[PDB]
Amino acid sequence: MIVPVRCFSCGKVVGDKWESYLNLLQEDELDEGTALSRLGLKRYCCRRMILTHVDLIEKFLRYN
Amino acid sequence: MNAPDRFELFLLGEGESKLKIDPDTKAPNAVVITFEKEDHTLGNLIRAELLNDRKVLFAAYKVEHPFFARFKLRIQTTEGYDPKDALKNACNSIINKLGALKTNFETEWNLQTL
Amino acid sequence: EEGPQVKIREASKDNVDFILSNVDLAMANSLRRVMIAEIPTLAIDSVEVETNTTVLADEFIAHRLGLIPLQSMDIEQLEYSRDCFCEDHCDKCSVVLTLQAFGESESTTNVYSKDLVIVSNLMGRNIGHPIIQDKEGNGVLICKLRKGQELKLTCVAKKGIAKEHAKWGPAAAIEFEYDPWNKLKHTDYWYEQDSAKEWPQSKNCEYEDPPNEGDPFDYKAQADTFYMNVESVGSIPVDQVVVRGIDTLQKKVASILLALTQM
Amino acid sequence: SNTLFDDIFQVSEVDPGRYNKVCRIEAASTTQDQCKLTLDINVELFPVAAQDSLTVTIASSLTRSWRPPQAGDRSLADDYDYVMYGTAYKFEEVSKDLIAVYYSFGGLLMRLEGNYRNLNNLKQENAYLLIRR
Amino acid sequence: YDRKVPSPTGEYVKEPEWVLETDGVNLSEVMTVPGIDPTRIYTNSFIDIMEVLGIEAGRAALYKEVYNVIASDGSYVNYRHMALLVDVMTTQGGLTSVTFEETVEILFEAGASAELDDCRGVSENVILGQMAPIGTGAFDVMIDEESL
Amino acid sequence: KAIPKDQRATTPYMTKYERARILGTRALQISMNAPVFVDLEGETDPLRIAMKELAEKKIPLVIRRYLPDGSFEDWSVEELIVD
Amino acid sequence: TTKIPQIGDKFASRHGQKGTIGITYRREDMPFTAEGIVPDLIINPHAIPSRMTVAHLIECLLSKVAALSGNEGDASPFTDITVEGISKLLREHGYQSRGFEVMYNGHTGKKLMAQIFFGPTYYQRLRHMVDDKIHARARGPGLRFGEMERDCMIAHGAASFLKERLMEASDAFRVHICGICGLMTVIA
Amino acid sequence: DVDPAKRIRVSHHATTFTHCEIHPSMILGVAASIIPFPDHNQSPRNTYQSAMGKQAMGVFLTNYNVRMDTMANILYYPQKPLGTTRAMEYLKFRELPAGQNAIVAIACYSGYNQEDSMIMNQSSIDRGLFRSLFFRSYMDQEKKYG
Amino acid sequence: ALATGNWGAGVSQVLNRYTYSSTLSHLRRTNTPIAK
Amino acid sequence: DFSARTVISGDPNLELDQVGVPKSIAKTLTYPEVVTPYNIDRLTQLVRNGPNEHPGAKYVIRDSGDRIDLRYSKRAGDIQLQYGWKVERHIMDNDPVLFNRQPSLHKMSMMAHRVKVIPYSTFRLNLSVTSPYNADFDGDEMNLHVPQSEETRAELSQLCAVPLQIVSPQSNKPCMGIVQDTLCGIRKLTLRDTFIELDQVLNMLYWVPDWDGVIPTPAIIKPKPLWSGKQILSVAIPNGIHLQRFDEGTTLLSPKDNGMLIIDGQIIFGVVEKKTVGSSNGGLIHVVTREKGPQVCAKLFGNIQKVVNFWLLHNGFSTGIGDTIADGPTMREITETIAEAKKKVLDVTKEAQANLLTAKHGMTLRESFEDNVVRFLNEARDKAGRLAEVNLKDLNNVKQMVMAGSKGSFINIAQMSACVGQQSVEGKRIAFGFVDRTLPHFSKDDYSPESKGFVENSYLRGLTPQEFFFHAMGGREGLIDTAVKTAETGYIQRRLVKALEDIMVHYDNTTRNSLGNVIQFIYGEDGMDAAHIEKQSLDTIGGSDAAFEKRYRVDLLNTDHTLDPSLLESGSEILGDLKLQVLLDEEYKQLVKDRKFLREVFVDGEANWPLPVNIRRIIQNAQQTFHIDHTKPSDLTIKDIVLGVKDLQENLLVLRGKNEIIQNAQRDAVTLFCCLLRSRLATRRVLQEYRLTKQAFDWVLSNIEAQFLRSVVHPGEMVGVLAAQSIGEPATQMTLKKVTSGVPRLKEILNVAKNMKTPSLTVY
Numbered sequence A: 001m002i003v004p005v006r007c008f009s010c011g012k013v014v015g016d017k018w019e020s021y022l023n024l025l026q027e028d029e030l031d032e033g034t035a036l037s038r039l040g041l042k043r044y045c046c047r048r049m050i051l052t053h054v055d056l057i058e059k060f061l062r063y064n
Numbered sequence B: 001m002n003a004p005d006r007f008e009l010f011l012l013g014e015g016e017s018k019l020k021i022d023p024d025t026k027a028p029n030a031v032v033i034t035f036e037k038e039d040h041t042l043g044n045l046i047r048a049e050l051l052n053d054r055k056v057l058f059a060a061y062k063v064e065h066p067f068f069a070r071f072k073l074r075i076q077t078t079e080g081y082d083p084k085d086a087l088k089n090a091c092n093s094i095i096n097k098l099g100a101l102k103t104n105f106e107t108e109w110n111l112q113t114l
Numbered sequence C: 001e002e003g004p005q006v007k008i009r010e011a012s013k014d015n016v017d018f019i020l021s022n023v024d025l026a027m028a029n030s031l032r033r034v035m036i037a038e039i040p041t042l043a044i045d046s047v048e049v050e051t052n053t054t055v056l057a058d059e060f061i062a063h064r065l066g067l068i069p070l071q072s073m074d075i076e077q078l079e080y081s082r083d084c085f086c087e088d089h090c091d092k093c094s095v096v097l098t099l100q101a102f103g104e105s106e107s108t109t110n111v112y113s114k115d116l117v118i119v120s121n122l123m124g125r126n127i128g129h130p131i132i133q134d135k136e137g138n139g140v141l142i143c144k145l146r147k148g149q150e151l152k153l154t155c156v157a158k159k160g161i162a163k164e165h166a167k168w169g170p171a172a173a174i175e176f177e178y179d180p181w182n183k184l185k186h187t188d189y190w191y192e193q194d195s196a197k198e199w200p201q202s203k204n205c206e207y208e209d210p211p212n213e214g215d216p217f218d219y220k221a222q223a224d225t226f227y228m229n230v231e232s233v234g235s236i237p238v239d240q241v242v243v244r245g246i247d248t249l250q251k252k253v254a255s256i257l258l259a260l261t262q263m
Numbered sequence D: 001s002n003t004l005f006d007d008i009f010q011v012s013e014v015d016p017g018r019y020n021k022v023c024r025i026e027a028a029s030t031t032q033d034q035c036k037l038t039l040d041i042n043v044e045l046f047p048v049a050a051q052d053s054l055t056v057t058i059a060s061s062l063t064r065s066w067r068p069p070q071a072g073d074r075s076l077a078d079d080y081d082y083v084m085y086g087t088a089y090k091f092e093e094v095s096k097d098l099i100a101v102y103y104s105f106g107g108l109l110m111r112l113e114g115n116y117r118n119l120n121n122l123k124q125e126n127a128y129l130l131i132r133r
Numbered sequence E: 001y002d003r004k005v006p007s008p009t010g011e012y013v014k015e016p017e018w019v020l021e022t023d024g025v026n027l028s029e030v031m032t033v034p035g036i037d038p039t040r041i042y043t044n045s046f047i048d049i050m051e052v053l054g055i056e057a058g059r060a061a062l063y064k065e066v067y068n069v070i071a072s073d074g075s076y077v078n079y080r081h082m083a084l085l086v087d088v089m090t091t092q093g094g095l096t097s098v099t100f101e102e103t104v105e106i107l108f109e110a111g112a113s114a115e116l117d118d119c120r121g122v123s124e125n126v127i128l129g130q131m132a133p134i135g136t137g138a139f140d141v142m143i144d145e146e147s148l
Numbered sequence F: 001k002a003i004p005k006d007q008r009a010t011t012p013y014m015t016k017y018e019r020a021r022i023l024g025t026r027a028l029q030i031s032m033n034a035p036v037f038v039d040l041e042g043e044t045d046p047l048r049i050a051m052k053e054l055a056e057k058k059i060p061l062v063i064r065r066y067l068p069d070g071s072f073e074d075w076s077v078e079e080l081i082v083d
Numbered sequence G: 001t002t003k004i005p006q007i008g009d010k011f012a013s014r015h016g017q018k019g020t021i022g023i024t025y026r027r028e029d030m031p032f033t034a035e036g037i038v039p040d041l042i043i044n045p046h047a048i049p050s051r052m053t054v055a056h057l058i059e060c061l062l063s064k065v066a067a068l069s070g071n072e073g074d075a076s077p078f079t080d081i082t083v084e085g086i087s088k089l090l091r092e093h094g095y096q097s098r099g100f101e102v103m104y105n106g107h108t109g110k111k112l113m114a115q116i117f118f119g120p121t122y123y124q125r126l127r128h129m130v131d132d133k134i135h136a137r138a139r140g141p142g143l144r145f146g147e148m149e150r151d152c153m154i155a156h157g158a159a160s161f162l163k164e165r166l167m168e169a170s171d172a173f174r175v176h177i178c179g180i181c182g183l184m185t186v187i188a
Numbered sequence H: 001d002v003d004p005a006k007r008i009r010v011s012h013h014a015t016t017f018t019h020c021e022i023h024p025s026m027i028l029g030v031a032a033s034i035i036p037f038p039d040h041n042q043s044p045r046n047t048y049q050s051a052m053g054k055q056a057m058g059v060f061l062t063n064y065n066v067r068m069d070t071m072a073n074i075l076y077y078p079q080k081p082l083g084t085t086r087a088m089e090y091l092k093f094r095e096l097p098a099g100q101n102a103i104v105a106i107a108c109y110s111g112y113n114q115e116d117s118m119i120m121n122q123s124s125i126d127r128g129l130f131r132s133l134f135f136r137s138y139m140d141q142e143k144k145y146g
Numbered sequence I: 001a002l003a004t005g006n007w008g009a010g011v012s013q014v015l016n017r018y019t020y021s022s023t024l025s026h027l028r029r030t031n032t033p034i035a036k
Numbered sequence J: 001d002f003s004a005r006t007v008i009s010g011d012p013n014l015e016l017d018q019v020g021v022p023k024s025i026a027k028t029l030t031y032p033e034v035v036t037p038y039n040i041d042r043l044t045q046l047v048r049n050g051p052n053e054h055p056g057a058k059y060v061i062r063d064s065g066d067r068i069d070l071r072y073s074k075r076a077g078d079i080q081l082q083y084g085w086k087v088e089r090h091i092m093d094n095d096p097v098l099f100n101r102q103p104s105l106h107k108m109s110m111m112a113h114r115v116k117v118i119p120y121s122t123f124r125l126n127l128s129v130t131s132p133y134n135a136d137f138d139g140d141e142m143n144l145h146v147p148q149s150e151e152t153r154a155e156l157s158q159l160c161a162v163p164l165q166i167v168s169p170q171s172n173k174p175c176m177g178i179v180q181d182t183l184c185g186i187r188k189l190t191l192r193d194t195f196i197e198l199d200q201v202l203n204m205l206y207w208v209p210d211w212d213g214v215i216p217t218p219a220i221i222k223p224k225p226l227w228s229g230k231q232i233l234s235v236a237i238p239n240g241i242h243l244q245r246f247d248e249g250t251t252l253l254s255p256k257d258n259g260m261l262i263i264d265g266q267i268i269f270g271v272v273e274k275k276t277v278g279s280s281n282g283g284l285i286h287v288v289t290r291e292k293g294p295q296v297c298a299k300l301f302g303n304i305q306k307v308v309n310f311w312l313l314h315n316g317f318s319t320g321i322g323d324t325i326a327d328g329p330t331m332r333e334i335t336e337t338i339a340e341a342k343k344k345v346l347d348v349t350k351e352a353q354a355n356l357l358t359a360k361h362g363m364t365l366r367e368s369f370e371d372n373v374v375r376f377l378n379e380a381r382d383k384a385g386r387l388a389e390v391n392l393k394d395l396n397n398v399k400q401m402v403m404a405g406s407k408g409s410f411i412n413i414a415q416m417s418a419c420v421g422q423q424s425v426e427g428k429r430i431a432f433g434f435v436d437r438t439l440p441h442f443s444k445d446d447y448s449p450e451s452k453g454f455v456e457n458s459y460l461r462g463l464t465p466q467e468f469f470f471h472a473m474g475g476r477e478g479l480i481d482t483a484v485k486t487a488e489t490g491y492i493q494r495r496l497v498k499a500l501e502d503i504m505v506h507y508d509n510t511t512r513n514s515l516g517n518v519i520q521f522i523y524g525e526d527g528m529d530a531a532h533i534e535k536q537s538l539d540t541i542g543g544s545d546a547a548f549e550k551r552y553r554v555d556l557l558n559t560d561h562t563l564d565p566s567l568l569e570s571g572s573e574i575l576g577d578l579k580l581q582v583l584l585d586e587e588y589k590q591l592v593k594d595r596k597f598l599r600e601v602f603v604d605g606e607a608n609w610p611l612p613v614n615i616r617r618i619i620q621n622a623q624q625t626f627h628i629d630h631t632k633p634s635d636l637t638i639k640d641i642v643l644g645v646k647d648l649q650e651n652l653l654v655l656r657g658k659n660e661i662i663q664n665a666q667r668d669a670v671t672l673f674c675c676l677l678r679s680r681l682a683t684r685r686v687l688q689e690y691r692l693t694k695q696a697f698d699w700v701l702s703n704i705e706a707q708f709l710r711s712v713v714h715p716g717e718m719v720g721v722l723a724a725q726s727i728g729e730p731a732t733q734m735t736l737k738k739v740t741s742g743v744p745r746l747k748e749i750l751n752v753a754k755n756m757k758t759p760s761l762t763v764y
């Protein structure tokens, strides 16, 4: 619904990287993989976390 | 639910001990100790040292079911040599080589930048 | 200093790559495990919810609060709540943190873990503080509000071990390798046409001599040298994941000598 | 307490077929027209090549636990490179008016054809096997 | 087809033979055709076997139809289970197929026929509060006054 | 309608069903504080006790076997061979 | 309620094979890659060759590349996506190219003789779980014993059981009975 | 000179075409449009997936908090599949997914995953893997025809 | 008739909402009452 | 009532006969246990714990019939039990309970297990009980039933308990074996090259719970102490167990490590796979059951599992996409394989197109054409798949499963890696459901492979759209056929059981209905229990006349054809003795008749037939047990043998009546077993082959006789139900030529249908 706090599998914090990841794509124009590796998410387990997040809360916030 | 609390993996119920030591019937100068609220971390380590001891005739451990944090270690030794003595000898070495290693490390880390 | 030998090759606030040298696989593996499972650490483990008009449910939020890593350098000097003589919690067994947020702005207001206020007496032990490692010093995103929405909470942290719930774990991944060439033949490589074309060379191979095709297999060799790399989440600095890691084992094994003595 | 056959062999052939650590020597006796060895060996612990040659002794000691080296730090009823320990399962292939005794070393197998040690080769297990290069 | 037959020296050998196989069945009449072996003619219609060759030959056809079915899938069941079945099907002398308050209908008939219920079934025994004379119930147990 | 002790034609071996029923009738009795005939060389478990009983041949019971035609033979526990 | 996964809950890939969780292991105890990656889930090889679900295996290869490279991996049917191509790309990225990795046993740290096909695959949590599914009716004041269960008990010969189970608790009434006219006419 | 790893196709022996397919993957329905590589599966299995998908938990609508239905399952942390189909775009499966990308090993390891069973990572669970919300609504009417 | 399925009956059913694509699927179902 | 139902899971750490029951379920179900001085203390404690702490209790009932409710009861902490009260206690470790997976189609779907109380919420089971219950761990649930009295507990443990159902009557072999992992791995463990080192050895050894504590001696001493995989498994196979088996050219030096040979409980040669340790006619679990009994056999499946899954946990095993890729060169050969078959097809086509093809005899031209193209295309699929099999290596993990026996077969290799092949709907190639075509992407009158459903591609490679759709047509037909099978089968099964349910064996050995009618004058025509019957070869039947006379003829009056004097002590002294010769002529005449008789019974010459008392394995035991030297003459005499074997025949009793009729029955019942007997213990075999001593010989006999007597069926068995369930239950795994077959046939049989679908006469 919202970035998860850590990689389910390794524990790395990943919940402090979502705003940046998204800034890194739309503001500095990197392809998703280059952007991930810039946030230091280099094992495929963490990469999967950000790359396949879906921020549903952004929809949930539209209701009154 | 029917899930046993997680604390049960490291913390002794009422009435339980760290060790129970029992004589083994099968062969001489043998013992079986059951360790509670422990698992492989200890169990493979005590074990593997017991085997660096040449008065150690047998050593082996197992966790009989993965649901319970308990292991069972069987030491057999040469005539005259108490197995509980072989397990002080072996827990002793352990502590000593680690001793060692936290020092070799605390060192190597001020030799260090970043 | 004779015995098990160390050899850091990199270090960083966050990771420490090293090489253990002159030790058994078991003690190596054991230290790996301890670092993963049994180093004490501090983590939200109770959450009272005064108000949540958020779009997330409470246990969803709670769960997320248990996961925010909290400073833990001085955690030996916090007693486990279950050893303390207080009724429930207090300042010897617990930090208490507050969280209030209100979606004041029109646009969407984020709640981050810097918005966590400690509310209890620390006795100047360095614990409790939300850890912060992003450029903006937000740390972790906890929630999001809309204009009109509210969330007020208290939390209690408590000392704990990842065995009991991973939130309490300090370490994150732990690289661990040995014998990169395969000399020990501890593994047997799968392949279609050629084993060496088809498997990638470990970085750890440089550090070690390739074998020579003549050399008949060495039955006596053992596993003596290990390539590790411990990565910290941050509640505990790294060197300290190891040192407390070695130290926790050493206490495990001493509780075993103490209880032969009591037999 | 004894030893019980002992001779020197010529290696015809070394088949590994399908295995990696293990291979099947076909050897001859230098001496007898009659006495042969087909035998399975751990080639990683003890390599072996075509035409190499072998001093081979069955023996029968120097059934209680097994206890590590230590007795083994002086006490070697071996001056050899290579020692196995098996079990005879025999079939006394008593074929032609030559013998064949069979032997299994945790499943690494042997067979001796020949004749002169019929009143020699244990009916029985306790049987070691020993090789120098 | 190949047919295992003993050879002049005693051992079994293959000896092919032609065989005819038909769609449709006229056993009584085809049996009688010159040149065939009437002693080895077969059909998968066990009814016709029983009509021409009798109850026993039908029983043994029927088994062999049952056994074919079960082996054609490739499984194996011991003889005696299929033998039991096929006996149950043929013991009256022909081929018999095996395929608060209700029921009253049936009890009225019982009445009027003077039905004698042997009381060996498990339901009847339930209604009566008893064990059925099967397995562990097929004997009685009594106190051994004759012993020291 | 009864069949003299000689001339009895049924197996001299105990069947699995008789054995099961004996042991269990007897354990039912031992479980209701019925006197026991054998040395409890520790046992507390009534089935187990009963089986000790059956092995020492101290179960005084008789198996009445009906034949399909109404007629019956009586075989004692003592006498039945247990295999 | 929040439902946290448990022994007993059901899960599936998208290739028409489910399972239940038969136990959980904390991460220490799981096998690991030299990079210290550990599995979230471990499925048994015996579940594969008969069902011939090669698309599972291909999804896992493709999915490893996708994660490593940050692209969405094209799994549609009827294209020119190939394993060979997938495998190439994954080799470019440093892994052996059929998706095997060396792993190490958790309990010991020793390497594993065999290497292990390891990769992300998309799994679904399916509804309908050990808590909805467990009951246990033995009174105080399926799940039955029907025709077929009786028949098995007859087969084993268990008459006493069959009487106990199929009784009434409807008490045994007693009754006198003439031995000439079997009826319950007897004045007692 | 064709690619040894491509499938065999049997060429246009046709100069009379009147039409052409838009895309062959459009023969499939909604459910089977979510299976990756169905053309590499034995056919009954794609049939069994096409049922199970209907039991998976995801986010059925963005408005769940405001509905009140008999029963509902929302997964904490839906992830979109690393392996998708081009049909999914229309089915919005990336936006309202029903699944998570799990790191999976295929291995014999302890014997507790035999006979269509699985070992799952407890630590992974602790940190949220496959956790979901369940909601039950109960209703009741009042008085009636008395 | 909308509340029942009373028509030909199973003609009207409650819309599945387990998951987004189970919904779409239900809306796109067909049924045949009653030689291959 | 007194029962629970949940989800099942497997567990390698439970014994075959256990079931794990969650603690919550164990505090819900209860057993009424009577206070006595043997249990008043335990019952007391269980009362004080009460309903909600397990080992506890929910009610106490006194003298009165008064029911004391421990959860409410203001006196629940203060009960002083009396002898003769009752306590309803929670179930607890080792109570017997009955466990059942529905549908219960045969009796081993309801077996008694020993409780083990465990945490979490699933009922748990040993992997090897799975197959009788027909259960797996993807959802399946099963029901557990608690017996309520002492007699009922005895019935369940002394007749329905799992150990007693290892060997079943259905097929006179085991119905439980080693499966899945432990089967993949026992083979791996047992290869030539698998050696283990001391650290891992001792942990494997301590893993077997009743290892005597002796470390065995290593098969390698020399550069290094290394033990074999063989030896370590052997620790779990008990002493005095012998088994041998020859595979396609196994010898006693198995180049390939084929077959199997095991002596005194130690593996000598052979890799262990499904033929040895599976649920197989004459493998280890069938041997161990009989030689040492049910309880040890049931331990054995856990000691083998403990060992082997330990080893496999540290060895590892996996499978992956790689295991389905065959070589570039293999692929080209597969693709040509396939191209040639499409050219065969193309000629047969042109040939029918020119009107040159002939049908033969009531078979249409087009039927001929199709029969030929489908042979072609199947023959291609198959060659292509043999191709791929061959090319994969021993370390190919798909292959390693197939070789073990644990999962998968050739067709699976083939279709994954080489080619899926011709799809079919109702026995035929995909039909023209558009007018003269199978899909609109093709032109009309196209009978080619592709047009009619040949799928050339493998799964790895992927299907084309047209293939894809024809394979779904295919597939759908088996989904349908499957539901029709399951439903047809279930109705059959119930009707057979209702038909046969009252048939029982009686204490006259007769099998009868509830009327007392006779169905069979003796059960099974032989009076045996099918559980005690094994496939044995009847020796007299086969072979040439010369060969039978070398092996059995003893001619004491002929210096070439007597018993050499090294066979027997008396050997010198019997040469030319006339009156021994008279006995021996008599034994031969009976061997001769035997062979004639049997060749009339078995017209075919089939020598291997189920009979009770595995004589070869008794003799093999005698040989082990008396340490028998092949190198010394025996002290048996001619008369000892010849008359000893005649006397044993008289005591192989099935029927015991004093009249002539029952005697004839008895003799007829025991004829075939007596032929196998006289063939196996004939004089020259006893001396020249077996080399028995007098003492071993006398042991052989008295055992034959005890075992024979223990195979007889027991009166009271409900063989009806059994028959029916034995025939029905395997008619349920008919999930699957041009004669009506399989289930519809079998409907056609039991129904006695006037109007059968394919009636046929076979005329020789």
Ligand SMILES: Nc1ncnc2c1ncn2[C@@H]1O[C@H](COP(=O)(O)OP(=O)(O)OP(=O)(O)O)[C@@H](O)[C@H]1O
Pocket: G017, G018, G050, H116, J136, J138, J139, J140, J735
């Ligand atoms: N051990 C096995 N050996 C041979 N085939 C198997 C085996 N296990 C599963 N199958 C095959 O898998 C198919 C169905 O798979 P599935 O996983 O749905 O079985 P299942 O677990 O019994 O299904 P369910 O429990 O929902 O009834 C069957 O047609 C069967 O042939």
Ligand SMILES: [Mn+2]
Pocket: H115, H116, J136, J137, J138
């Ligand atoms: Mn299944």
Ligand SMILES: [Mn+2]
Pocket: J135, J136, J137, J138, J139, J140
């Ligand atoms: Mn199932």
Ligand SMILES: [Zn+2]
Pocket: A007, A008, A009, A010, A011, A012, A043, A044, A045, A046, A047
């Ligand atoms: Zn990660």
Ligand SMILES: [Zn+2]
Pocket: C081, C084, C085, C086, C087, C088, C089, C090, C091, C092, C093, C094
């Ligand atoms: Zn406190």
